[PDB]
Amino acid sequence: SISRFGVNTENEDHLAKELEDLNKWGLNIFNVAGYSHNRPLTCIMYAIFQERDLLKTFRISSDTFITYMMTLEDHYHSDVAYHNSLHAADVAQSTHVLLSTPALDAVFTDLEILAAIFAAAIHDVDHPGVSNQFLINTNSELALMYNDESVLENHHLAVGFKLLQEEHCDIFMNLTKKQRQTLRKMVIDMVLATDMSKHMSLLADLKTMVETKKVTSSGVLLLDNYTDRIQVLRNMVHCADLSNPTKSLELYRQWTDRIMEEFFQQGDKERERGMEISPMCDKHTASVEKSQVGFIDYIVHPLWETWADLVQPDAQDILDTLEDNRNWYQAMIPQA
Numbered sequence: 319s320i321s322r323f324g325v326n327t328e329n330e331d332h333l334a335k336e337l338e339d340l341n342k343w344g345l346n347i348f349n350v351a352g353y354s355h356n357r358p359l360t361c362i363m364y365a366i367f368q369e370r371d372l373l374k375t376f377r378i379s380s381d382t383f384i385t386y387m388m389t390l391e392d393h394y395h396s397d398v399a400y401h402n403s404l405h406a407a408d409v410a411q412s413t414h415v416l417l418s419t420p421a422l423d424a425v426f427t428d429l430e431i432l433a434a435i436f437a438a439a440i441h442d443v444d445h446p447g448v449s450n451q452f453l454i455n456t457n458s459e460l461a462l463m464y465n466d467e468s469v470l471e472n473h474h475l476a477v478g479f480k481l482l483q484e485e486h487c488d489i490f491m492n493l494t495k496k497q498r499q500t501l502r503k504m505v506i507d508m509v510l511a512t513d514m515s516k517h518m519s520l521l522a523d524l525k526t527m528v529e530t531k532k533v534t535s536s537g538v539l540l541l542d543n544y545t546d547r548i549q550v551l552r553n554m555v556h557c558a559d560l561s562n563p564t565k566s567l568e569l570y571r572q573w574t575d576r577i578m579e580e581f582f583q584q585g586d587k588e589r590e591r592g593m594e595i596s597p598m599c600d601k602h603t604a605s606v607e608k609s610q611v612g613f614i615d616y617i618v619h620p621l622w623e624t625w626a627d628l629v630q631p632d633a634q635d636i637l638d639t640l641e642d643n644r645n646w647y648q649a650m651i652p653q654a
């Protein structure tokens with residue numbers, strides 16, 4: 319059972335210390351990365367799977383698991399400022415937390431739990447650090463492969479599933495054929511749902527099902543068919559993907575630094591190509607602070623307010639943090 323990936327003996331203890339917060343929204347993944355020799359995705363996934371007894375439940379070899387996860391992590395670009403393996407580790411650990419929210423207790427099968435955490439792990443692999451629209455506009459190889467439709471999201475799925483082809487890395491070897499087929503369908507569904515171009519419609523359909531939600535006597539949501547279960551799962555992974563502004567301000571600020579570095583790098587590439595600069599990618603004019611206020615007001619809060627509404631009162635502290643964070647960025651804009 320691996321306890322360190324480096325030569326620092328002090329790190330083994332520090333890492334296990336950080337990992338005591340595995341089931342908490344307040345886990346600090348930057349620290350995890352620091353104490354794991356930059357293996358946040360390998361280590362958090364190993365911790366999550368052991369925490370949930372998923373290697374035992376699905377007869378996944380620890381050895382095969384580590385090899386697969388190391389190589390998946392290696393397919394995230396460490397030179398991409400935001401969409402790298404630390405983001406993937408964060409989305410996976412955040413999904414692990416949402417899976418345990420009391421309102422959803424006993425709702426999901428082990429296969430659905432597995433699908434959801436694996437989807438989070440893979441959902442941005444081999445991201446080149448520019449948007450779908452930038453790929454479409456530049457006639458990139460990916461956009462020609464995917465006919466301009468959910469270009470990156472299709473690619474992330476293709477890489478994550480292609481890596482399982484080699485026997486040495488097939489973590490799903492001992493699932494049954496029907497299990498593998500259902501898992502693949504769920505993961506494909508979840509990852510494609512992370513495409514921001516689908517968010518307005520995802521949310522609409524979410525606000526819709528919150529309306530007719532049936533909380534049972536004991537306080538647990540009744541989600542009786544597959545259709546309802548995969549809809550909550552697809553929204554959960556989406557929420558996890560868009561969870562940075564709901565974390566402690568200390569963490570949220572570090573995430574903002576990264577996403578703006580990535581966005582402004584795209585702006586530079588656009589300029590360089592004589593392309594039209596996308597407003598929020600232009601380092602010469604865009605306000606980092608307004609960009610987060612708007613991001614929260616227009617995208618993150620409506621999603622989380624609706625999730626919160628669905629899992630009442632589970633997500634109340636998340637909302638308060640979000641609103642506090644929103645307030646902090648606003649207060650950072652020098653104008654009234």
Ligand SMILES: COc1cccc(Nc2c(C(N)=O)cnc3c(C)cc(S(=O)(=O)c4cccc(C(=O)N(C)C)c4)cc23)c1
Nearest residue numbers: 448449450512514559560562573574577598609610613617
């Ligand atoms: C889920 O996919 C993404 C991609 C990029 C950022 C985020 N989350 C954001 C973050 C974040 N920390 O998660 C921060 N700021 C954001 C700001 C300021 C804006 C947007 S946006 O309105 O979704 C937007 C507007 C215009 C272009 C693009 C783009 O490049 N892609 C690929 C979607 C994105 C998202 C985020 C999520």
Ligand SMILES: [As]
Nearest residue numbers: 361362364365
């Ligand atoms: As670990």
Ligand SMILES: [As]
Nearest residue numbers: 389484486487
């Ligand atoms: As392999």
Ligand SMILES: [As]
Nearest residue numbers: 401514559560
């Ligand atoms: As994103």
Ligand SMILES: [As]
Nearest residue numbers: 581596598599
């Ligand atoms: As942009």
Ligand SMILES: [Mg+2]
Nearest residue numbers: 441442470512
């Ligand atoms: Mg993505």
Ligand SMILES: [Zn+2]
Nearest residue numbers: 409441442559
């Ligand atoms: Zn993501």
